[PDB]
DNA sequence: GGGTATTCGCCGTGTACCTCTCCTAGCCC
RNA sequence: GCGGAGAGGUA
DNA sequence: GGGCTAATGACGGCGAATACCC
């Protein structure tokens, strides 16, 4: 089984799991851990917004790639943003701080 | 079923607990199954029509 | 996306909430099920959350984008694009003011401890069973009085006025916004300076730490009470519609709807003034209600329709392992992915991989548009969409230019280490299965048994650097764990090398002389001479001797022809003996290592491709089978077992007359079947290893046997000699469910045939074993998960501290010899100071200098004992380690990089081994001396008496080995009253028995002679005169202090030591006069009136793995904790049975007012007028890290872990660095507590880095004045992490709740400093490749 | 295929602004704002960048000169 | 009232993948 | 037709 | 078929909350 792009999941924005549905590979935390283990952080970033996550990042670098580059920019995954949302539907404010 | 096993390295191709088999049994066509997926479309009532 | 930093958690107030809201939602419906259309104000909401479909109203008025802000005049939905339906949030007003259960229900109840109300009343308010007294004015009932009903009524009917009480949740938020915090903070200082009593001061520190963080954080204590609650936008909780007209819902949908049934109900009895009863009860269900949206799962489990599993709330999205952090913010589910069978593709090299053509067109899919596209084949997009789904030859011959040198990750599903992910070069095959080079499956643990594989894609110019530097296969051939290789040859190679370079006394060929290897392939390839027969060759090895120059010498070597052979391939650098020799797995392995040493990476990786190629191609032509008669029952078994069996039956028939109990026969039996399994063992051995008699000449002779099985053994390609034993011998003994040995073993063997009993009895051992495997996976994982959370945010970060501390390594001597010797120990640590050569001012090794080979081997060359390195613990750094304090080891040689994150590498080197190891595994009379050299006693005062022994005074005795050339071989601990029998300077012959000892008795030795003389030891109160006749039997029993009857509990039975004449004999030197205290068990056999000799006998007295590994990490107090010294100086008694006998160390200098508690089973091994050091031995047992680090310091915690877990590994036979052990070590102690004042708050646990920083800056200021001093704590991985300063970081493991409701409280704020958040985040790590940039933003920051 | 980076991470010992200067370089080439200084052989331009720097003619400094001039 | 035991209750318990069925509920016109 | 339960299997 | 309304078979560890002994 293989997929480059295709259907992603609704609430958080990842592309399915599965072989019936095109469906990706689930990149765990141990494999994350094992990417920390070298000094792969560029490889880790993509794997985690531009390949899953990330929906402005993932239509750019399709385009970006379609047209011959390999550049991208990383953004900030779009599961983060639900769990912003999840923890603030609680009684927790949960600001991201800027100065 | 049963074929002629030899058991020896054959140039790592059977290296771990990996499998070699002669194009003969391919072709005596004796692994080949057959295998039967079912599909449905169903036609349903919508309100619009 | 805007550029941020610093995730802040706080309370939300009402007002916060109104502000996130767009509308209200009143009523609970959702969707009409008849017209997909949203509900007018419902949980969906085109009005509140936003439009259904991009850019157009429900009613259709606006459809067209030219209105961007309008909002439709019948619909007041707002015309935007659908994924703001995403981000906006709503609001339901709560009529009755109702508690979050997150603050109340969280183990510390920050309500009750808050109000300094006990939670039980906090639950009596909550479900209306009874009321609370908020000010209830001029009465004798006080401001958290809880009352009941009829309470609540007499008191109203006396007191019509000056009383206000209420009810629920809103008194609460009534006693909440009543509360002064300020004046209480300062009320509660003072009571704190007045109370002087443990319990009450930790209750009450707790209190004032809440406060103060209430009133620095901002958060207002009523906000813990809700009185809006803010709803998910629609589309985080869907309510998708299932084909078929019917609907899948989150079970959010429906606690919402629950939640505003029970809300509007209650609004509206409100609205009728219906009694109080039902408004109660009502109240009492929006309670139920809303705690089940916020927390389902801490009441009675509201359960879903008809299913009877309980539906999952928010709070169980969070938490949880299923739910998030760790499901979709850690282990995201990537594209460009793809997965399959992996198979072996020997023709591969080390550097990639086969990747079937399908696969690899489906993964690179946009960048064969981008390479279609920038050719011209294709003119538009679709074009090229539709050309890659015809599949035309052009598509295949863009596939291949694209893939050139594109690389791919491969992985396997357990990654336990690194290792379990690495990169290579595709080559595009035929067919479905990925082709995995054999080499690296060690790395991998991958076997092709249907293994499977993932395929990743890495897209960016980044990635694909970062892949083929630091991931590619060729890179990693170092495991970073130990130095060791990972690359080594595994089954067939080795088989085949090994049968290659073996010799055999005579065969084709024999003796001939050889101008090269070249000739000798010519003989071995045209059949003129066997692949193994003695020759005499001429080779050309070169040596690198000078500075990088290869010198050749061209000599004349007796070898075999396939030796030869094997040399054609070996790289010019090594010397040909490395491949002289029989050549096994071992043999393999360090022929590996040394090319690696001497020559360097690349040449490494040609010479292990050229050992894989050569050993499978003449493993092939051996032609090497496995028969039924290739394994060699040993002739004389049958005698074995029959002698077995007449010894067992001679021993049966003599217990049935009863003269031996029934454990001493079933220990006999044991043994004697240990005892033939070896003989039968050993002749099988020896029937099957030696066993090819073949002929010279004339006359015979014997050599080692070319039997497969035996060969497979030997090489260590497959199979140990425990696996021939169970082949071709008897198969040992077996285990009962319980543990306990069977007494008949199984003597059949697999050529042979078991029988039913003995197969079931086998059958037992193999589920045991496989079930094993699985808990003690599963146990594995979650260590490993927890070791790699702790250690995450360490890294590399300065390039030396400048330090000199350091930790004293020496080789570990356990017991008969050594266990692991001092250069792998050392190897690759800089060191602390320089070691002096055996005569002072003769500097070995300067300053520190990272210890290569080189110098280790200059250290064997000297006899250097123990070395001082740096180590990470004791680093200086703040906010990481230096590469120095570190050291090299890497799957590169050279010292460790700045940037490189030790602690994940440390983690999963320490626990993969452990989870490995599971899957794999699917008396002390007499010392003897193991090699010759002088005894030396450490540590002791004795006494000579008239017999001649070196009588042993002291419990921390020591009995160390010097040799020859001043270095301790043998090491050896000698408790209180074991016999000697040579003293101090003694020179000791080869293997001379010098000790002897009871196995199950440890006598109490007496020092003088003498009548033994009782005092106190009155009969009848304690003890009971049972005596023998004249020749001195007895049965009187001395019972220790928790065995000593009832009546005689306080007095204590005494031995004064007295001489012939009837005087106490004192003690040499001393005054003190000889009181011996009878311990436990003391049998006085030797009545009155016979001479003590010294040495009569007083008192006859008869883990590990994961979980003892687990346990040392967690720090797990031994529940039996022995007991150490915190001062030195004289001990003494005191107030004698409380129930817990008293302790009173009293310093010579020092003050005196130390008690410590002893329970009565407790003995005591030092006298009371002795002299004592700080932290040593007074009771037996194991010792909790935390009092080692408390009173011996931090390089002693550190070294008894590190050795304590080393042994359990080594156990295993798995070799792992120090250095990762004392990375979670420096990880656990983190945190210090604070014992003088000046900038804390005098008790606060707060990390040691802020108080060095604190040093610093006092330091800094012209003034030290008090400074900071501190004591430093050890905490176990689990609470380590759980006190980290990111919140992020403990919650992605945690309780999330508690950490989630401290950090709320407390409003505390994350700058994110660490590798798990950055992930979180999905920005760069800070770890590796990141650092710089992180770096970068650090200048960025603070600058112009 | 280059199958060994061990003399590019022997001309700057951190191994990992190694990956920073190589991918700069390798940037540079692919969107053609510049040319390859090495006879390519149907390498993709990242194998390029790395045979550039283990020759000597690539580094940091050398970026930063030529960007700056 | 203050310290020590003892009960009590919460939190955790390895990864990756592949098949199948079944999903708000109940009653009457 | 995103999800979640239950069952089984693979390494 | 369509419309309307509202129980029992884990276990350990740890830290807080009583039980009780002075
Ligand atoms: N329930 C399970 C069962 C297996 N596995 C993993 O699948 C592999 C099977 O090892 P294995 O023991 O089957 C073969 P190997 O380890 O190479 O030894 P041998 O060839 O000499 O027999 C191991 O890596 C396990 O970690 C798992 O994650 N969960
Ligand atoms: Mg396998
Ligand atoms: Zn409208
Ligand atoms: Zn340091």
Redo the contacts with the bound molecule.
Sequence with gaps: ?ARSTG?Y???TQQP??????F?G??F???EVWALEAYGAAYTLQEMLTVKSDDVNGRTKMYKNIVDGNHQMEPGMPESFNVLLKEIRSLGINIELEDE | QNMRVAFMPWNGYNFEDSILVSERVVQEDRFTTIHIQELACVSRDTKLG | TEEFDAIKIALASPDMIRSWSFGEVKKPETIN??TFKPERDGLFCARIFGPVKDYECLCGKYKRLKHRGVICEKCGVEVTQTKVRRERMGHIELASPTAHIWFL?????RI??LLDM???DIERVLYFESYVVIEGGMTNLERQQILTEEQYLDALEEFGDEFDAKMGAEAIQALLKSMDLEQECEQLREELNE?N????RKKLTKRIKLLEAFVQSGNKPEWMILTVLPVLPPDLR?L?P??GG?????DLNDLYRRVI?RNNRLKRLLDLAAPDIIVRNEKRMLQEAVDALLDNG?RGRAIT?????PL?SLADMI????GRF?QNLL?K?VDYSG?SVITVGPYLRLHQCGLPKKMALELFKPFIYGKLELRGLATTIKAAKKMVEREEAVVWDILDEVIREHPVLLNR??TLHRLGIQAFEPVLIEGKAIQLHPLVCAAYNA?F????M?VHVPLTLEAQLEARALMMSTNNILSPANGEPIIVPSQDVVLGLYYMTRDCVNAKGEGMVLTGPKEAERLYRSGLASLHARVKVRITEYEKDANGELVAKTSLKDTTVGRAILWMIVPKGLPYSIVNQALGKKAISKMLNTCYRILGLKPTVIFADQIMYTGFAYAARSGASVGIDDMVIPEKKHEIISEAEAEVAEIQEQFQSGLVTAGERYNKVIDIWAAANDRVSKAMMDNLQTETVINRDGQEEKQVSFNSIYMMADSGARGSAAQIRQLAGMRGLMAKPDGSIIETPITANFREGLNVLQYFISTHGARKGLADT?LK??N???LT?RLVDVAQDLVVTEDDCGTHEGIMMTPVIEGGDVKEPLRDRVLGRVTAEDVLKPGTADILVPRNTLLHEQWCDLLEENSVDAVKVRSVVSCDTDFGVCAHCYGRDLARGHIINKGEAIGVIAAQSIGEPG?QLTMRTFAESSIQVKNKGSIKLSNVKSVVNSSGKLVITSRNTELKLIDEFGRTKESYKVPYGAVLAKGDGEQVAGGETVANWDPHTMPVITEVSGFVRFTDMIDGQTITRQTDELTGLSSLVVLDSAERTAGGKDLRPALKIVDAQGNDVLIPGTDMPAQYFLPGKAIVQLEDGVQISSGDTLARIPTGGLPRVA?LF?A??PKEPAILAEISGIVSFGKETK??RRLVITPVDGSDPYEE?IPKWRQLNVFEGERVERGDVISDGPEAPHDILRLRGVHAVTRYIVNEVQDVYRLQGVKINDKHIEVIVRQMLRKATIVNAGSSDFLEGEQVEYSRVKIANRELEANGKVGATYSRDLL?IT?ASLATESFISAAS??????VLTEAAVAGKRDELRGLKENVIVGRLIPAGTGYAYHQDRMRRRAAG | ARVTVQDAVEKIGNRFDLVLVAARRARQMQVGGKDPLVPEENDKTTVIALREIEEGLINNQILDVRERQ
């Design positions: 089984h259907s999941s609704l609430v399915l799991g599965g072989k019936a549905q469906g590979q689930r765990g935390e141990m | 099920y008849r229900k969280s183990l510390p109840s009750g401890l006990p939670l039980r109370t009593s443990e319990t009450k869907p998708v299932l084909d019917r609907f899948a819902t989150s049934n801490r329709g008809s299913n009877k599993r999952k938490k949880g392992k299923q760790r282990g589910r997965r599903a357990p076997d048994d249907g293994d499977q993932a699985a996976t599963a594995s994982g979650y998960r989870t346990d967690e797990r107090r129930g817990k508690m176990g609470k493991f945690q309780e999330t709740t508690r």
